[PDB]
Design a protein around this ligand. Structure first.
Ligand SMILES: O=c1ccn([C@@H]2O[C@H](COP(=O)(O)OP(=O)(O)OP(=O)(O)O)[C@@H](O)[C@H]2O)c(=O)[nH]1
Length: 204
């Protein structure tokens, strides 16, 4: 069975980078999947909210949890799967899909990957990335403006109204489920090294 590794942390905490550095340091076939690929398909009314940064994309229910549970279960079974592609500029699931063939190690990262216990128990290892809040926001702002075509004021408004409150209420609590907590994120090469060393040992 593939070795499942769940990765979480707050928004722009560097979960993706951590996953990349882990793969970089890890022949084993490895693939990185993100919880973001499974955001729910929004109605026109909800999408309208999103355009004004008035939609909560940080609440457990913003994700298509059923699809996630099912997709991850199939990977666990060694079956090749199809994975959705989300568009952050339109807040909409694209028609195109991405094929993901079997692998020895699978990394799953998302702001709420440890929330649902069903999903949580599918991970043989769970990592939580801990980064300073102002550092996280700074990134969020530049990344949102740069890669997701958004406006500063709409970003800050959505962050203060939804992201932060959701982080404290839904995300942060899940840190208790982590087997390893990683402060400073991707930059904590020592912690990442022990982790890849631990992953390597188990695969032996
Ligand atoms: O349509 C959407 C969907 C999601 N989001 C917002 O994206 C946010 C989280 O998605 P992430 O911040 O976790 O991005 P990432 O997977 O690349 O993480 P890092 O590697 O940078 O750590 C959530 O905080 C959600 O509100 C939107 O702004 N719009």
């Amino acid at each position: 069975e593939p070795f499942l590794i769940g990765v979480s942390g707050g928004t722009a905490s560097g979960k993706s980078s951590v996953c990349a550095k882990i793969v970089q340091l890890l022949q084993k076939q490895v693939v990185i999947l993100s919880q973001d690929s499974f955001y729910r398909v929004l109605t026109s009314e909800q999408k309208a909210k999103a355009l004004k940064g008035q939609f909560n994309f940080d609440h457990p229910d913003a994700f298509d949890n059923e699809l996630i549970l099912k997709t991850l279960k199939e990977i666990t079974e060694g079956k090749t799967v199809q994975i959705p592609v989300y568009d952050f500029v339109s807040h909409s699931r694209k028609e195109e899909t991405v094929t993901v063939y079997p692998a020895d190690v699978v990394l799953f990262e998302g702001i709420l990957a440890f929330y649902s216990q069903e999903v949580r128990d599918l991970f043989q290892m769970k990592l939580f990335v801990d980064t300073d809040a102002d550092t996280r926001l700074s990134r969020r702002v530049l990344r949102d403006i740069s890669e997701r075509g958004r406006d500063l004021e709409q970003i800050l408004s959505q962050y203060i109204t939804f992201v932060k409150p959701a982080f404290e209420e839904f995300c942060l609590p899940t840190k208790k489920y982590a087997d390893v907590i990683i402060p400073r994120g991707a930059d904590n090469l020592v912690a990442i090294n022990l982790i890849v060393q631990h992953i390597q040992d188990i695969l032996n």
